[PDB]
Enzyme design. Structure first.
Site, PDB file in Angstrom:
ATOM      1  N   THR A   1      80.889 -88.518 102.776  1.00  0.00           N
ATOM      2  CA  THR A   1      80.980 -89.289 101.541  1.00  0.00           C
ATOM      3  C   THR A   1      79.682 -89.355 100.766  1.00  0.00           C
ATOM      4  OG1 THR A   1      80.482 -91.433 102.532  1.00  0.00           O
ATOM      5  CG2 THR A   1      82.790 -90.697 102.574  1.00  0.00           C
ATOM      6  N   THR A   2      78.633 -88.676 101.253  1.00  0.00           N
ATOM      7  CA  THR A   2      77.367 -88.583 100.510  1.00  0.00           C
ATOM      8  C   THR A   2      77.072 -87.089 100.430  1.00  0.00           C
ATOM      9  OG1 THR A   2      76.124 -88.706 102.608  1.00  0.00           O
ATOM     10  CG2 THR A   2      76.328 -90.743 101.338  1.00  0.00           C
TER      11      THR A   2
ATOM     12  N   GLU B   1      84.159 -97.985 101.507  1.00  0.00           N
ATOM     13  CA  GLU B   1      84.432 -96.674 100.877  1.00  0.00           C
ATOM     14  C   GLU B   1      85.936 -96.455 100.922  1.00  0.00           C
ATOM     15  OE1 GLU B   1      81.489 -93.833 102.553  1.00  0.00           O
ATOM     16  OE2 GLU B   1      80.596 -94.258 100.633  1.00  0.00           O
TER      17      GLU B   1
ATOM     18  N   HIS C   1      80.387 -96.410 109.764  1.00  0.00           N
ATOM     19  CA  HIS C   1      80.729 -95.021 110.062  1.00  0.00           C
ATOM     20  C   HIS C   1      79.977 -94.590 111.321  1.00  0.00           C
ATOM     21  CE1 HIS C   1      81.806 -94.216 105.632  1.00  0.00           C
ATOM     22  NE2 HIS C   1      82.808 -94.807 106.301  1.00  0.00           N
TER      23      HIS C   1
ATOM     24  N   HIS D   1      76.004 -95.723 110.651  1.00  0.00           N
ATOM     25  CA  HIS D   1      75.427 -96.389 109.484  1.00  0.00           C
ATOM     26  C   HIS D   1      76.535 -97.144 108.797  1.00  0.00           C
ATOM     27  CE1 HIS D   1      77.169 -92.647 107.981  1.00  0.00           C
ATOM     28  NE2 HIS D   1      77.537 -93.389 106.956  1.00  0.00           N
TER      29      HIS D   1
ATOM     30  N   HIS E   1      78.062 -98.896 104.815  1.00  0.00           N
ATOM     31  CA  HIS E   1      78.073 -98.905 103.339  1.00  0.00           C
ATOM     32  C   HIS E   1      78.455-100.337 103.014  1.00  0.00           C
ATOM     33  CE1 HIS E   1      78.228 -94.465 103.099  1.00  0.00           C
ATOM     34  NE2 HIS E   1      78.821 -94.592 104.284  1.00  0.00           N
TER      35      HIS E   1
ATOM     36  N   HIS F   1      69.243 -94.373 101.337  1.00  0.00           N
ATOM     37  CA  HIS F   1      70.618 -94.678 100.864  1.00  0.00           C
ATOM     38  C   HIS F   1      71.393 -95.543 101.842  1.00  0.00           C
ATOM     39  CE1 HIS F   1      70.590 -90.508 102.402  1.00  0.00           C
ATOM     40  NE2 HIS F   1      71.703 -90.821 103.048  1.00  0.00           N
TER      41      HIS F   1
HETATM   42 ZN   LIG Z   1      79.053 -93.211 105.701  1.00  0.00          ZN
END
Ligand SMILES: [Zn+2]
Length: 256
Positions: A195-196, A103, A116, A91, A93, A61
């Site tokens: 957030t995941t 996000e 993040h 990581h 997004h 992801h």
């Molecule tokens: Zn994140």
């Protein structure tokens, strides 16, 4: 199981993770006019001089740059935080196009990507225990806009070819995360969640106001990664962001 497609994306997550419709979910839209300046907020302390990166992993992801967190090396303290939080991984997004990918949003504006840097509260001993606590993690969020290249990001971009598909990892030592920080540490902060999935409500979010600039070539390389594993139908790893969630009974505070 869960992912970012039409059949397993963010709107489906609540079935396996009911907390998805919880009281302190992330990300959120940061309304700059409603966020209140809090003079009591102490300046943020980012001490990454002794950071020890170890590996980079495509987890299906995103890609995580992992750090040795068995000692007090790279830590975040100060700001809204009480105590010391150790860096475990960072990581990003990002989107399929420069107009989306972040996000958190700022007055509904979406950035091309969001970084993040994930840290856990050392009073809980390990990351697994920290995520079960309301003040277990501190995530430093930094927006990315497309323009000039970020020199400090290039080492990450160049290793992505070696971890194209889910489950692949590569040695990634001596990476300095200080090269991913903007000039200013002014920030907004609020209580939220991962957030995941599992979407645990254990995060003090600290989102920097100043974005960093990355080049179009840099973000294009993120978009060449794959969500799938080797030997499977190619599914580009793009749009791996969860949209803004209801603010509910929360106040976003500004350090400036
Ligand atoms: Zn994140």
């Amino acid at each position: 199981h869960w992912g970012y497609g039409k059949h397993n994306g963010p709107e489906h997550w609540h079935k396996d993770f009911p907390i998805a419709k919880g009281e302190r979910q992330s990300p959120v839209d940061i309304d700059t006019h409603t966020a209140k300046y809090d003079p009591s907020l102490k300046p943020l302390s980012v001490s990454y001089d002794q950071a020890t990166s170890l590996r980079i992993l495509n987890n299906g992801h995103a890609f995580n740059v992992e750090f040795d967190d068995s000692q007090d090396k790279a830590v975040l303290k100060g700001g809204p935080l009480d105590g010391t939080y150790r860096l475990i991984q960072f990581h990003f997004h990002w989107g399929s196009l420069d107009g989306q990918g972040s996000e958190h949003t700022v007055d509904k504006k979406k950035y091309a990507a969001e970084l993040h840097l994930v840290h856990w509260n050392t009073k809980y001993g390990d990351f697994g225990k920290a995520v079960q606590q309301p003040d277990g993690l501190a995530v430093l969020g930094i927006f990315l806009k497309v323009g000039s290249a970020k020199p400090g990001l290039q080492k990450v971009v160049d290793v992505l070819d070696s971890i194209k598909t889910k489950g692949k990892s590569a040695d990634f030592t001596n990476f300095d995360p200080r090269g991913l920080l903007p000039e200013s540490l002014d920030y907004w902060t609020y209580p939220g969640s991962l957030t995941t999935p599992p979407l645990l409500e254990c995060v003090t979010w600290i989102v920097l106001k100043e974005p960093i600039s990355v080049s179009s070539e840099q973000v294009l390389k993120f978009r060449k990664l794959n969500f799938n594993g080797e030997g499977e139908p190619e599914e580009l790893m793009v749009d791996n962001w969860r949209p803004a969630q209801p603010l509910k009974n929360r106040q976003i505070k500004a350090s400036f």
